[PDB]
């Protein structure tokens, strides 16, 4: 691991169903690491800036160093560019793939070591065409997919309430989520949150926008269905004010908001001892990223609410791995390969990049 | 890191100046993995305690595990036996140190690779015969340490004083830090801690019982001193409640009171996200426990006020390891080989064992 990192290279992709940014770094040994970053432009930035975060900003920062000071490279990091978690988190993922791939050790084994096998795959529900999800939730009951998120708010209320009760009457082997992505105004908030909860879904995510923390505290207070904090908590900095507000009962830890895998773990690690679950969301990510969030939540425990990183089986016309990201019977599957237990297809990321 | 645990054999030593518990993991393919248990009777429990915790009690859930199912052994570990998180602990560096030698890795890189490359070493004066420490101090300068901590409290409050003075008058090389361990009663604590910080110490450690959170919080009010905890604080759940209850500035970091070194990781990064500094503290441990602490803060930028591994090289008479624990000019190294950078010895196992 005293092999220092001589190459980072970048792809910026389209990816037919999603942009995404794609890093390798090569350390003079040859061994390569990937890592992806799956930017939401109106929530966690644009492809562009966390373009722009690894190739100007941490290039500098991570050519020369030795692939062993990961910690300190992720420290400086965070300070190095504002925002832009999904590059850092997209730098963390490669430097782990890297030191896995050169010490010939799975992620996980990086990260603690490994309290699970298999993690139970969630898809979301949130085509505007409710057929379409219908034949699409044929489908996942037939691959033995058990839990669905319903995506709420994005139309009216009556939309909402429709998808449940079909879901409820021709679909009651999948669990219910529902993630209304900070869509509710004030105005509406309460009684389209109170209505829902009826359906006694498994938690209801972020009902509005991610700096109303006194209304989220509020709508927890309203019902007894589980209030998860998604768009409100990044890392453990917001963790801990999440908690000390008590805006909600869990949180949905994803890498690219904590912008690492370690302080995705302290997110769900400072959850637990408030006595909060944790859930393993995603972003509109790949395979890469999917593999990356994998490795997290099988070294951490507190994550007991699932996945959803269903993106690259159900939603990406085809994914960029070499290897598809591998899930049986509604069960991803943890790798135990060196790092983290795929490669990018380099033809595939030539084919689909808009800018490289 | 698939294959299985098939051994623990455990050895409780009477070390010539200190009792501590040693324990051995060997793997199917021979490896082996070495971790030290270092119990503080009227603090954290007893020898006795831990070698039951480890001999009777963890023995069956560590035997016949994968060496790469860490994360779950110690998940499982904690919630199967009461207290002894000192036994948890020498269970987590063995575990580690197996899986480093597995590897051909350092500890540290099993942590998250590392941030630092030596340590700044504090050496405690402690002796009820203040001239034995002025010739300790000697020997402290002369090898360059320049960290110390003044163990206050044991006497009346003048031989605090006058220590502290002469201190500043004859050895003002090094920087002076303070530690009540606990010491203090109720009707005495305001008054002394307030002569005491008088002389601008870089700390005051723990001045009255654990349970008095209040208290240390009053005390915390008082002065510009730094307040930290030590006994106050064991795990992240006692960081949770210190921190919200504003009982200290910072807080003293053991291995042997987290019951493991992610653990440990886990007190600094509430702390960090409250604004709450970090020291390297430690209990009457020899070199196998200095290298478990030495590694975890090796991973751990969050610990910067430096560490007090010093008794393998100023207390005991002699050390377990076959190799020294190396300390140059003052300064904690971080090994770099595999494991956790050296080896417990056979033979002196066996002659300072006086149960095994
Ligand atoms: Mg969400
Ligand atoms: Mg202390
Ligand atoms: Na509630
Ligand atoms: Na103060």
Redesign the interface.
Same mark, same amino acid.
């Given at each position: *691991?005293?092999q220092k990192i001589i190459a980072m290279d970048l792809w910026h992709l389209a990816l037919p169903v999603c942009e995404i940014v794609v890093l390798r770094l090569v350390a003079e040994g040859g061994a390569e690491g990937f890592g992806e970053a799956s930017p939401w432009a109106v929530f966690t930035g644009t492809p562009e800036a966390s373009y722009a975060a690894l190739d100007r900003y941490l290039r500098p920062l991570v050519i020369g160093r030795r692939?062993?000071?990961?910690?300190? #490279?992720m420290?400086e990091a965070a300070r190095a560019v504002a925002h832009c978690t999904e590059a850092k988190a997209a730098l963390d993922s490669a /430097?782990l793939d890297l030191?896995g791939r050169i010490?010939? *050790?799975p992620v996980? +084994? /990086?990260?603690?070591?490994?309290?699970?096998d298999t993690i139970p795959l969630s898809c979301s529900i949130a085509n505007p065409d409710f057929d379409a999800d219908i034949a699409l939730m044929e489908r996942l009951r037939a691959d033995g997919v058990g839990l669905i998120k319903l995506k709420t708010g994005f139309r009216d209320h009556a939309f909402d309430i429709m998808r449940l009760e079909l879901i409820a009457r021709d679909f009651p082997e999948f669990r219910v989520r529902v993630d209304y992505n900070q869509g509710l105004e004030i105005d509406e908030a309460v009684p389209r949150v109170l209505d829902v909860a009826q359906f006694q879904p498994d938690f209801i995510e972020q009902p509005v926008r991610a700096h109303h923390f006194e209304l989220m505290a509020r709508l927890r207070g309203l019902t007894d269905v589980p209030l998860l904090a998604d768009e409100s908590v990044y890392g =453990?900095?917001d963790?801990?004010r999440a908690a @000390?507000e008590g805006i909600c009962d869990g949180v949905s830890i994803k890498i690219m908001k904590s912008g690492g895998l370690?302080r995705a773990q302290?997110v769900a690690? #400072?959850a637990a +001892? @408030?006595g909060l679950m944790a859930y393993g969301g995603d972003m509109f990510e790949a395979g890469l990223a999917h593999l990356a969030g994998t490795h997290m939540i099988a +070294?951490? =425990?507190e994550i007991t609410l699932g996945c959803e990183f269903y993106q690259a089986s159900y939603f990406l016309n085809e994914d960029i791995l070499e290897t598809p990201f591998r899930v049986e019977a509604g069960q991803v599957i943890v790798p135990?390969g060196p790092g983290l237990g795929a490669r990018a297809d380099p033809e595939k990321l030539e084919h689909y990049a808009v800018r490289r």
């Open positions: *691991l005293e692939v062993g000071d990961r910690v300190a #490279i420290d /430097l030191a010490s010939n *050790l996980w +084994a /990086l990260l603690g070591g490994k309290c699970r =453990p900095e963790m801990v @000390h370690t302290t690690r #400072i +001892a @408030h +070294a951490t =425990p135990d």
